[PDB]
Amino acid sequence: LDAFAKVVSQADTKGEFLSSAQLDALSNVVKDGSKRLDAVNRMTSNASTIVANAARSLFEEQPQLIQPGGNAYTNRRMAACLRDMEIILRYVTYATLAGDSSVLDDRCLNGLRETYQALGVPGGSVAAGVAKMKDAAIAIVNDPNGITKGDCSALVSEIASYFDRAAAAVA
Amino acid sequence: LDAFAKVVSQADTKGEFLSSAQLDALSNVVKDGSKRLDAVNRMTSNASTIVANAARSLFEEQPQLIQPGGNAYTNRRMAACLRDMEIILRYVTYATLAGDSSVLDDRCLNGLRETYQALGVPGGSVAAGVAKMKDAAIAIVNDPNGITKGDCSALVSEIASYFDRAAAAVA
Numbered sequence: 001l002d003a004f005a006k007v008v009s010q011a012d013t014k015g016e017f018l019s020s021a022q023l024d025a026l027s028n029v030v031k032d033g034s035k036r037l038d039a040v041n042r043m044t045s046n047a048s049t050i051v052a053n054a055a056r057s058l059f060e061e062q063p064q065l066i067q068p069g070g071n072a073y074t075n076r077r078m079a080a081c082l083r084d085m086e087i088i089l090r091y092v093t094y095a096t097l098a099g100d101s102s103v104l105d106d107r108c109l110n111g112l113r114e115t116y117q118a119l120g121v122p123g124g125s126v127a128a129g130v131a132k133m134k135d136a137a138i139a140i141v142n143d144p145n146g147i148t149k150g151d152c153s154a155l156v157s158e159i160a161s162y163f164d165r166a167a168a169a170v171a
Numbered sequence: 172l173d174a175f176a177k178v179v180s181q182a183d184t185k186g187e188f189l190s191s192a193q194l195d196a197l198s199n200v201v202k203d204g205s206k207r208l209d210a211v212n213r214m215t216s217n218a219s220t221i222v223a224n225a226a227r228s229l230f231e232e233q234p235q236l237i238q239p240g241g242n243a244y245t246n247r248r249m250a251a252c253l254r255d256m257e258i259i260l261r262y263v264t265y266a267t268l269a270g271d272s273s274v275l276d277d278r279c280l281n282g283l284r285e286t287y288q289a290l291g292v293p294g295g296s297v298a299a300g301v302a303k304m305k306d307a308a309i310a311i312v313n314d315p316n317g318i319t320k321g322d323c324s325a326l327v328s329e330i331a332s333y334f335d336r337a338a339a340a341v342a
């Protein structure tokens with residue numbers, strides 16, 4: 001409704017009906033909103049798979065994490081690791097829904113590096129796990145089956161930026 | 172983006188991903204936006220037909236308006252009458268696009284009765300012309316050909332309210 005009211009102001013200033021350009025512009029706002037909801041829906045609905053695929057890739061790459069002495073050794077520690085990735089993924093979907101990183105920053109990333117240091121969690125391995133969630137999430141967002149075909153590339157880039165910001169915040 | 176950010180706040184307060192209810196709610200916001208744009212597009216694109224159909228119905232019903240002594244007698248007066256209906260229709264599409272009557276009131280309806288009195292234009296006949304534009308506009312908005320089938324009844328009621336407000340403002 002924000003973009004619609006601004007277009008009214010512009011048309012009224014001209015004293016004209018909406019132009020074809022203004023109608024296509026507003027139509028693209030509605031299309032972008034719908035694509036954004038598909039991305040949030042696909043990431044939300046598949047949240048456990050995104051977490052599991054990333055964790056599997058991280059542990060296979062960094063087996064020390066789940067060998068004796070590792071920070072994610074024993075299932076109890078492993079489970080808390082999966083829970084952390086779920087939390088970060090949750091705030092990435094919030095950012096995707098809102099179109100900005102304000103909640104992701106204020107509620108999740110601000111001070112998170114310092115929580116991990118208080119705990120001895122290796123933030124650089126959290127960053128790798130977040131970057132792997134990114135790739136799993138994007139493969140799910142970009143799957144063309146089950147959805148109206150179209151371009152989601154700008155949205156996928158924006159989603160990648162949220163994952164990269166979260167990873168860089170904890171490294 | 173306004174409704175999306177509010178949903179984020181609610182989900183974060185719960186500490187959860189978006190629920191299916193919140194996703195359906197936001198999906199209906201995008202659907203309603205698209206339907207609203209169809210209504211504005213259909214009324215804008217057919218503006219001349221909406222004006223002409225209403226004027227034809229008004230003049231046939233009130234022939235004195237275009238007989239000698241009438242306020243819309245001679246084509247010059249007739250043309251200014253059609254131009255007035257076009258203006259009011261324009262601000263009704265602004266209200267439909269914005270979802271409220273704030274611009275329609277402030278820019279079009281406020282003081283319009285007093286302009287017509289300064290001119291001797293019979294406001295009650297303007298009101299009849301506006302009410303006939305309403306019926307022509309709604310028949311165009313509600314036509315099911317050329318568009319995805321669905322319910323537009325709440326939108327059509329809101330559009331009728333804008334036309335009725337404009338008519339009642341000049342009667």
Ligand SMILES: *[C@@H](C)[C@H]1/C(=C/c2[nH]c(/C=C3N=C(/C=C4\NC(=O)C(CC)=C4C)C(C)=C\3CCC(=O)O)c(CCC(=O)O)c2C)NC(=O)[C@@H]1C
Nearest residue numbers: 031034035037038039142143144147148149150151152198
């Ligand atoms: C990018 C992520 C992928 C993709 C997205 C895409 N979707 C559309 C169309 C729509 N998506 C929705 C969203 C919903 N409908 C519902 O019922 C719900 C709740 C379960 C949601 C979240 C809607 C309403 C539409 C419009 C109707 C439709 O189904 O088509 C498009 C087309 C947008 C456009 O017109 O340009 C796109 C691109 N499609 C891809 O190919 C990407 C993989």
Ligand SMILES: *[C@@H](C)[C@H]1/C(=C/c2[nH]c(/C=C3N=C(/C=C4\NC(=O)C(CC)=C4C)C(C)=C\3CCC(=O)O)c(CCC(=O)O)c2C)NC(=O)[C@@H]1C
Nearest residue numbers: 027202205206208209210313314315318319320321322323
């Ligand atoms: C009520 C007025 C009538 C009606 C509306 C209706 N439309 C949809 C679907 C869509 N309408 C649009 C709008 C545009 N697409 C463009 O390219 C442009 C610029 C020319 C505009 C303004 C869009 C993007 C959609 C979604 C994709 C599609 O074409 O379907 C619906 C379905 C909404 C829903 O999912 O519930 C409806 C109901 N349909 C009727 O039957 C009324 C007569």
Ligand SMILES: *[C@H](C)[C@H]1/C(=C/c2[nH]c(/C=C3N=C(/C=C4\NC(=O)C(CC)=C4C)C(C)=C\3CCC(=O)O)c(CCC(=O)O)c2C)NC(=O)[C@@H]1C
Nearest residue numbers: 065071072077080081082084087107108121122125126129
């Ligand atoms: C997984 C990729 C890595 C991993 C994680 C890990 N975390 C813990 C414990 C905690 N994680 C948090 C994180 C948060 N709390 C919040 O409120 C938010 C945002 C809103 C975040 C991101 C916290 C507070 C804790 C401590 C309390 C709790 O566990 O609930 C562990 C257990 C630590 C231990 O020594 O047992 C682990 C293992 N560890 C790895 O090695 C992976 C790289």
Ligand SMILES: *[C@H](C)[C@H]1/C(=C/c2[nH]c(/C=C3N=C(/C=C4\NC(=O)C(CC)=C4C)C(C)=C\3CCC(=O)O)c(CCC(=O)O)c2C)NC(=O)[C@@H]1C
Nearest residue numbers: 236242243248251252253255258278279292293296297300
């Ligand atoms: C048509 C249904 C009725 C009709 C109309 C009529 N109007 C005029 C002249 C004017 N109409 C306006 C109205 C507006 N100016 C604005 O800025 C706005 C909103 C932004 C409105 C609604 C104005 C200012 C005028 C005077 C200046 C001008 O004509 O541009 C006439 C001509 C009056 C005359 O005596 O020649 C007519 C006929 N008359 C009817 O009988 C219909 C019921």
